[PDB]
Design a protein around this ligand. Structure first.
Ligand SMILES: Cc1cc(CCCCCOc2ccc(C3=NCCO3)cc2)on1
Lengths: 40, 59, 255, 59, 273, 57, 255, 40
């Protein structure tokens, strides 16, 4: 129950439960498959 | 003895046989690990569990 | 992008990667397997330690120099002291095993040299004395050290003459046994998978060795100018499908 | 770092040995990295020993 | 539910009262196996003997004390009780301890209540309301050194601020590293020859640290902190024999030497009533 | 969720542990690519490492 | 014609027969079982030597005399040196096991005496010094010898006072732990099956013992007239469902 | 009504109403019937 009118006044947000490290761990242009050779 | 780019480099000697290249314990919150991003984040938490990935790139 | 050339063998808690392989040999085209009931005789249930014995043990390294004649290891002897494999060995009456053998030797594109890596089932050695002199036990159980074919004749030991395979046959014909070459220009490792080969379903691991692994320089090592004149050779071996049976008190063997 | 809770050691040795080509010399180096597997869990947040201060900063 | 059924005379070949205790069992014998009984009902459920109930009331687990005074020229705040801490543990005060050690492994959430009362020993004037800060300092966190260190910023570490005379209350999930807390541990932290033996090695749950936020007034004020702990969501495994001798140390089973006989001697014979 | 799957001996031409770090990627290698593993579950969600939680006290 | 009284336990390559048993206790009514995946944490495949470790080891015998106070063994310590069980123990990082304990003591229908045989999960001992003196490692790792409660206090050792169970609780209440009596007039053996009890799924076998087995004379031994005044007590124990994990170099432990 | 998000913050648990002393009072391997002889 929100007792207040504005959105800033609500409690903390709830877990992204998004999670996708590939923008950080695999930003390569041509896709690399694990097990296939790195450099062909 | 002072922080240097050189403490990132593990040296290798030609022609040695049987011998040891480096050694370290695995206290990820201390020692070599401590300044790494992993080490640095682990330190915001009290407990850790899981597998670590250690890789070596040859130059 | 798979090449015959790069390979990974993971066995137990240990992994080997080679980036310069030349395929792998599987003796007699058979892969190690456990002992089937139809072939069984001893009524005892066997023990299969699995991953604690079926991992890779790297024996101490050898040094190939221009004068090297070749080295010889016996199995299961070479492993008589490796971890739990060895304990099991001394503690059961009977045991059985196959192996993956990985011999390693890297150099550069200026070196030349070529080793023969061969597995000989039942390699009965000859006494250098001739006649019917026997080869004492200790001499055929060198352990991880193996036998150094360029060492001197000793008394009660085997002959170490390479053109004769330590038994009255010519080096040239060893190629009839499962084998692989390491030619610095091609190759940097040799891998052979050995199925269990015997005339009985299971045997004693201490009174009888069932294969000798032999690494023999054939085209002499030739290093580039002003290079150090030698290369180390390393042998790593992993028991596979091991089974032990008839547990008891723990064998005591000569020397 | 805690004893009961300790994780092991990591070592590295020559398996055969480094060999340099002709006309080449000296030491070669390995770079080494660390990251966590997807396996990893961290819990119970706390304050890091990695940063402290003696007076408030100002502009 | 019947507490006793009706049962009459017996002349059988089936004797429920003869057993062999050597077996380790306690055979479930009832009044009606050996006398003639009448029906009666239980009228009772055994509600208040549930382990959740047994361990579920607040018990005092710790009393500490800190003072508000001029820190000017104090070389060791910790030592002046300018702030103090507590190496968290639940075995220091021994009423709650005997209750928990009736079990080997125990798992529960904790609810803490902290009461803080002030005392002014040296004849005084006006007491300005002091605000206590309790902050949890887990293992491997910058321990605080002065009563007003950067540590107290507590940007990542839970801390509660309440007033002396009031009470603070909050609840912490089960923070054990294993599946349960060991009430006992017959082990070491590693196989060294001189390392401590017990649980203390197992139960290093960090310490809790208290301080007054207020600067000093002209008089000195003693604030005494009492921490109460209530187990909620209790789970207990493997019952053990109750503690008979007195306790000597947090975390070891050790009892004092030349202790006194714990079994009351009869005033009379074995035959005495 | 499985934290580790069961995996046994390997003798392949497909080596997931050899990579080229010069590329800038961190290849997602797991225990089961290089030792023999058994199944285990995560039992964990990563709740307390959410940025809302990290900056939210 | 089955009696509670006669029994046979066959485990591995070893069998025990008792013709005068008093049923058998299974701690907490649970039988030893392997570690399920849902409960697993370490990702390593475990090793299950089976019949080579799950057999019966008979520890050296004790002598009950009229002055005996009782003996105490810790598990897995007591077995730290038995056959391949012990090797596995020193060689893996973690291991887990349940046991069958069979305590034996026969006499005649003229003797009297009664022993309590009890298993205590997590038996943390007390220092006889009081205060917060610790009990050194060696003292809580007596090996097959176990601890003799009628031996003298030693320094760094535990207290050996029987009315207090070596921990500040009364002998009389040990009956809350799985236990069985050996009453010469009834019984001649005691058998207890111990499931693995811990707060973690698998643990170290050397830094932590998870049960102490305790044999305590309670009704003093009384021999017939002009009989020798003593009886031997023998303890035989068999690991069951043993699993080892995290193999490596081989632990080195104090003393 | 829980006012709080985490489970630790809820009140005491509610009676097991489990109750089974046999793991403690009768951990024998072969079942003993009351009335039948203890040792056969
Ligand atoms: C056994 C056993 C069980 C316990 C209790 C463990 C409790 C976990 C840690 O306790 C706290 C205490 C205080 C705080 C706290 N946070 C802000 C203020 O106080 C947090 C966790 O201790 N030994």
């Amino acid at each position: 129950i929100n007792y207040y009118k504005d959105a800033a006044s609500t409690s903390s947000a709830g877990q992204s439960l998004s999670m996708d490290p590939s923008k950080f761990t695999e930003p390569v242009k041509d896709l690399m498959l694990k097990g296939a050779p790195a450099l062909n | 003895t002072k922080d240097e780019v050189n403490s990132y480099l593990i040296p290798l000697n030609a022609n040695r046989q049987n011998e040891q290249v480096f050694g370290t314990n695995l206290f990820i919150g201390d020692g070599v690990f401590k300044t790494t991003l992993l080490g640095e984040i682990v330190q915001y938490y009290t407990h850790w569990s899981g597998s670590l990935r250690f890789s070596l790139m040859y130059t | 992008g798979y090449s015959d050339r790069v390979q990974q063998i993971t066995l137990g808690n240990s992994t080997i990667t080679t980036q310069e392989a030349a395929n792998a040999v599987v003796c007699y085209a058979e892969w190690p397997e456990y002992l089937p009931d139809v072939d069984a005789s001893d009524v005892n249930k066997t023990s299969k330690p699995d991953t604690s014995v079926c991992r890779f043990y790297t024996l101490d390294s050898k040094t190939w120099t221009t004068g090297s004649k070749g080295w010889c290891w016996k199995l299961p002897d070479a492993l008589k002291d490796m971890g739990v494999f060895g304990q099991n060995m001394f503690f059961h009456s009977l045991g059985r095993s196959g192996y993956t053998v990985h011999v390693q030797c890297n150099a550069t594109k200026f070196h030349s040299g070529c080793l023969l890596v061969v597995v000989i089932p039942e390699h009965q050695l000859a006494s250098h004395e001739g006649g019917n002199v026997s080869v004492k036990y200790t001499f055929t159980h060198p352990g991880e050290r193996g036998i150094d074919l360029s060492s001197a004749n000793e008394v009660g030991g085997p002959v170490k003459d390479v053109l004769y395979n330590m038994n009255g046959t010519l080096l040239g014909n060893l190629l009839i046994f499962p084998h692989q070459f390491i030619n610095l220009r091609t190759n940097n490792t040799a891998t052979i998978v050995i199925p269990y080969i015997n005339s009985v379903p299971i045997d004693s691991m201490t009174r009888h060795n069932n294969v000798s692994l032999m690494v023999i320089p054939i085209a002499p090592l030739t290093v580039p100018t002003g290079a150090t004149p030698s290369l180390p050779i390393t042998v790593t071996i992993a028991p596979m499908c091991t089974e032990f049976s008839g547990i008891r008190s723990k064998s005591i063997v000569p020397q | 770092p805690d004893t009961y809770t300790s994780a092991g050691f990591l070592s590295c040795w020559y398996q055969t040995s480094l060999i340099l080509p002709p006309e080449t010399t000296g030491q070669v180096y390995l770079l080494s990295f660390i990251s966590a597997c997807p396996d990893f869990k961290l819990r119970l947040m706390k304050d890091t020993q990695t940063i402290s201060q003696t007076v408030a900063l100002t502009e | 539910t019947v507490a006793s059924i009706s049962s009459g005379p017996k002349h059988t070949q089936k004797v429920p009262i003869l057993t062999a205790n050597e077996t380790g069992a306690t055979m479930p014998v009832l009044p009606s196996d050996s006398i003639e009984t009448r029906t009666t009902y239980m009228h009772f459920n055994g509600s208040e003997t549930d382990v959740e109930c047994f361990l579920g009331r607040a018990a005092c687990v710790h009393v500490t004390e800190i003072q508000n005074k001029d820190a000017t020229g104090i070389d060791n705040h910790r030592e002046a009780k300018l702030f103090n801490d507590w190496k968290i543990n639940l075995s220091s005060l021994v009423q709650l301890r005997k209750k928990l050690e009736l079990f080997t492994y125990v798992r529960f959430d904790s609810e803490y209540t902290i009461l803080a009362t002030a005392s002014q020993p040296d004849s005084a004037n006006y007491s300005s309301n002091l605000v206590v800060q309790a902050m949890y300092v887990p293992p491997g966190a910058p321990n605080p050194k002065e009563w007003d260190d950067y540590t107290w910023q507590s940007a990542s570490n839970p801390s509660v601020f309440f007033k002396v005379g009031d009470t603070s209350r909050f609840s912490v999930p089960y923070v054990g590293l294993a599946s349960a807390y060991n009430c006992f541990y017959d082990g070491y932290s590693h196989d060294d020859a001189e390392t401590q033996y017990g649980i203390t090695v197992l139960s290093h749950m960090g310490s809790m640290a208290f301080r007054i936020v207020n600067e000093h007034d002209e008089h000195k004020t003693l604030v005494k902190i009492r921490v109460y702990h209530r187990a909620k969501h209790v789970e207990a495994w493997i019952p053990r024999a109750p503690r008979a001798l007195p306790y000597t140390s947090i975390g070891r089973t050790n009892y004092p030497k030349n202790t006194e006989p714990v079994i009351k001697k009869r005033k009379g014979d074995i035959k005495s009533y």
